[PDB]
């Protein structure tokens, strides 16, 4: 199914004998073989040592949000000396974390008990996902929690950590409540002083080294990303390479993968824009991160190959139709350098004829005129004749 | 009497310039094969 255009037609018709006529063959010819990766040239280490080595680590009622920017996120450092209990990642697979480059990251930080680790998830409820820390439904990031019974718990009980036991209303996603006003349980007003049906909304954890797996602290670091939108500041540890313009090549601008040729464009982007899609689902426009040069991404070759042939009983000679090309770019578009030599002898030859329908190669044109049986498409017709 | 002939490539419509086209294709490609047979019949009918 990859040696001759007649065998290709036999594959696309699922038969061992085909008749005379025209058959539009599918494109099984070229497979690209090279990849280039270009990323922003910032090679600082992200403050994961500051986030993951927190000696004083934030409580859950008033959790800390730290912005991380202008560095590289090396995941391999963290599990060198730290063991994570639940490395759940949402929206982004843990395997493809390295090749992405993130734009707006934030590291949440709080201490919760062992039973409430499941509550830090989109859609879960409880007193930690309703009154303390709520994750959005369309969340995109990963929550990293591990046991910290040796560090965050001491003998006699560690009462520094607090949580909102009671609250008037449910929290919005990513909303922090720090007020310590007295919550009224009944219809009577508390008037700011503790009494009957008046409790402090902040209750204290009772972490003790003698309790079970459920009653021990679990340091939780929640990362929030925004993938492949806006300019990016936090990339993976892959190195940036040179730029090869005017050729079909796989590009990796800030995590944006694709196959296509690049030329020089003259349109001007807005200051807050780094990507561009003249029509959505095309991603035609992009900025080179290294030089901030506006470019374009265009497709590289046409899908238009057809086979002109008589019946296989009559002869095995065949002609191929390359549509919408000047014939001189047939080996460029087909990419016959990586294709079979039997296809290359049909890729280029001595008898090249340019029709309006496309390039006809494998047959010789004539000044005389004969009666048509099978079409070509531009007022010309082909047939088998001496 | 006539209408403009059209044709649709299966890989470039649903796959595009993306990987795993064969795994995406062996399960769902005979629908597109039927539609390409219908479009070729429409073009031949328009010439006739």
């Amino acid at each position: 199914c990859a040696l001759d255009p007649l065998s290709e037609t036999k594959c696309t018709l699922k038969s061992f004998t085909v008749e005379k006529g025209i058959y539009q063959t599918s494109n099984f010819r070229v497979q690209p073989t090279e990849s280039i990766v270009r990323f922003p040239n910032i090679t600082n280490l992200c403050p994961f040592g500051e986030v993951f080595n927190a000696t004083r680590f934030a409580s859950v009622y008033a959790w800390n949000r730290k912005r991380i920017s202008n560095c590289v996120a090396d995941y391999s450092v963290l599990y060198n000396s730290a063991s994570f209990s639940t490395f759940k990642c949402y929206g982004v697979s843990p395997t493809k974390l390295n090749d992405l480059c993130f734009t707006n990251v934030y590291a949440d930080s709080f201490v919760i008990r062992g039973d409430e680790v499941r509550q830090i998830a989109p859609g879960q409820t409880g007193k930690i996902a309703d009154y303390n820390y709520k994750l959005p439904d369309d969340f995109t990031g990963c929550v990293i929690a591990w046991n910290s019974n040796n560090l965050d718990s001491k003998v006699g009980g560690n009462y520094n950590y607090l949580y909102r036991l009671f609250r008037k209303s449910n929290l919005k996603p990513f909303e922090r409540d720090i007020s310590t006003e007295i919550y009224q349980a009944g219809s009577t007003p508390c008037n700011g002083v503790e009494g009957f049906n008046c409790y402090f909304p902040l209750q204290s954890y009772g972490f003790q080294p003698t309790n079970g797996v459920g009653y021990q602290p679990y340091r939780v670091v929640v990362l929030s990303f925004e993938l492949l939108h806006a300019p990016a500041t936090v990339c993976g540890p892959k190195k940036s390479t040179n730029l090869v313009k005017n050729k079909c090549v796989n590009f990796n601008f800030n995590g944006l993968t694709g196959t296509g040729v690049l030329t020089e464009s003259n349109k001007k982007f807005l200051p807050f824009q780094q990507f561009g899609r003249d029509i959505a689902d095309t991603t035609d426009a992009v900025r080179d991160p290294q030089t901030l040069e506006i470019l374009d991404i265009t497709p590289c070759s046409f899908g238009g190959v057809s086979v002109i042939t008589p019946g296989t009983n009559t002869s095995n000679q065949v002609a191929v139709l390359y549509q919408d090309v000047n014939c001189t770019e047939v080996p460029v578009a087909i990419h016959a350098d990586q294709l079979t030599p039997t296809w290359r002898v049909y890729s280029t030859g001595s008898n090249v004829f340019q029709t309006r329908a496309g390039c006809l190669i494998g047959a010789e044109h004539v000044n005389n005129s004969y009666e048509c049986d099978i079409p070509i498409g531009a007022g010309i017709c082909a047939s088998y004749q001496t | 009497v006539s209408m403009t002939k059209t044709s649709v490539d299966c890989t470039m419509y649903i796959c595009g310039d993306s990987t795993e086209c064969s795994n995406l294709l062996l399960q769902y490609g005979s629908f597109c094969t039927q539609l390409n047979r219908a479009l070729t019949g429409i073009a031949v009918e328009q010439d006739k």
């Binding site: 048509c372 079409p375 070509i376 498409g377 531009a378 007022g379 017709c381 | 002939k5 059209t6």
Partner: peptide
């Protein structure tokens, strides 16, 4: 009469000159 991702437009066999000639 004003005329007009894998979508190709096949030209007709009978061009305008030969339709005019017929």
């Amino acid at each position: 009469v004003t005329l007009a991702n894998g979508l190709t437009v096949l030209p007709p066999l009978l061009t305008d000159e030969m339709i005019a000639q017929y």
